[PDB]
């Protein structure tokens, strides 16, 4: 198990423009295109991201390429983020994945807002952090995914992703 398989399970794979859980135009493996309600704006963003006239549809190779770029960016983002880097650096390799997962889904800014949870993770107070992370819009809106990520932070193992 690794970050790519983890996110592939949480985000799925779709080759045509779709709306994510919040209603935003997305494609591939959770690649957000735009928050604008315009499917045209979305189609424009897609072509620009892929470098060709896609008309709203891409190939698996293209999907995997975007996914790779996105994970890469997420990690680099964490590493240059003042509030996130120290936490990331304090964690083991499995837990690094749970943090990347959150950033991939909500963005740096979103994650940087979990101040108290972050301090608890830094202090390695696993159960306390898990309870705190659950007190959030994130948990209430996407509970199954949040439960998987939280369990990952709590246990430091891939159990929540086993049998999926
Ligand atoms: Cl969910």
Helix/strand/coil (H/E/C) assignment for every residue in 98-149: HHHHHHHHHHHHHHHCCHHHHHHHHCCCHHHHHHHHHCCHHHHHCHHHHHHH
**Catalytic sites, residue numbers:** 11, 20
Resolution of the coordinates, Å = 1.7
For 29, list phi and psi in degrees, rounded to 5: -100, 80
Cα–Cα distance between 47 and 58 in angstroms, integer?
10
Cα–Cα distance between 108 and 102 in angstroms, integer?
9
Q: Is 153 annotated as a binding residue?
A: no
Side-by-side strand order, sheet with 14-19? 14-19, 25-28, 31-34
CA count, 13 A, side-chain hemisphere, 103: 27
Q: Is 144 annotated as a binding residue?
A: no
Q: Is 117 annotated as a binding residue?
A: yes
CATH number for the domain spanning 147: value is 1.10.530.40
CB–CB of 54/44 below 8 Å?
Answer: no
Cα–Cα distance between 28 and 13 in angstroms, integer?
5
CA 155 to centroid of ligand 1, rounded, Å: 19
CA 98 to centroid of ligand 1, rounded, Å: 15
Look up residue 140 and give its two tokens. Answer: 């209430």
Look up residue 23 and give its two tokens. Answer: 């209603």
What are the beta bridge partners of residue 18? Answer: 26
Cα–Cα distance between 95 and 97 in angstroms, integer?
5
DSSP-assigned states of every residue in 16-83: EEEE-TTS-EEEETTEEEESSS-HHHHHHHHHHHHTS--TTB--HHHHHHHHHHHHHHHHHHHHH-TT
- DSSP 8-class letter at 155: H
Q: Is 123 helix (H, G, I), strand (E, B) or coil?
A: coil
Residue 128's domain comprises 1-164
CA 6 to centroid of ligand 1, rounded, Å: 14
CB–CB of 44/52 below 8 Å?
Answer: no
CA 52 to centroid of ligand 1, rounded, Å: 33
Cα–Cα distance between 79 and 64 in angstroms, integer?
23
- Give the total number of structural domains in the chain: 1
Q: Is 132 annotated as a binding residue?
A: yes
Look up residue 75 and give its two tokens. Answer: 């990690």
Q: Is 163 helix (H, G, I), strand (E, B) or coil?
A: coil
Q: Give just the sign of the alpha carbon dihedral 22, 26, 30, 32.
A: negative
CB–CB of 13/7 below 8 Å?
Answer: no
Look up residue 117 and give its two tokens. Answer: 């949870």
- DSSP 8-class letter at 161: G
């Amino acid at each position: 198990m690794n970050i790519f398989e983890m996110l592939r399970i949480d985000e799925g794979l779709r080759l045509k423009i779709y709306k994510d859980t919040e209603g935003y135009y997305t494609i591939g493996i959770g690649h957000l295109l735009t928050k604008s309600p315009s499917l045209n704006a979305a189609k424009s963003e897609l072509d620009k991201a892929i470098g060709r006239n896609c008309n709203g549809v891409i190939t698996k190779d293209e999907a995997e390429k975007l996914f790779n770029q996105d994970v890469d960016a997420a990690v680099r983002g964490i590493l240059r983020n003042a509030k996130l880097a120290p936490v990331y650096d304090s964690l083991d390799a499995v837990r690094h994945c749970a943090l990347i997962n959150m950033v991939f889904q909500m963005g740096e800014t979103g994650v940087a807002g979990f101040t108290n949870s972050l301090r608890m993770l830094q202090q390695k107070r696993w159960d306390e952090a898990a309870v705190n992370l659950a007190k959030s819009r994130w948990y209430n809106q996407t509970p199954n995914r949040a439960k998987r990520v939280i369990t990952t932070f709590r246990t430091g193992t891939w159990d929540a992703y086993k049998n999926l």
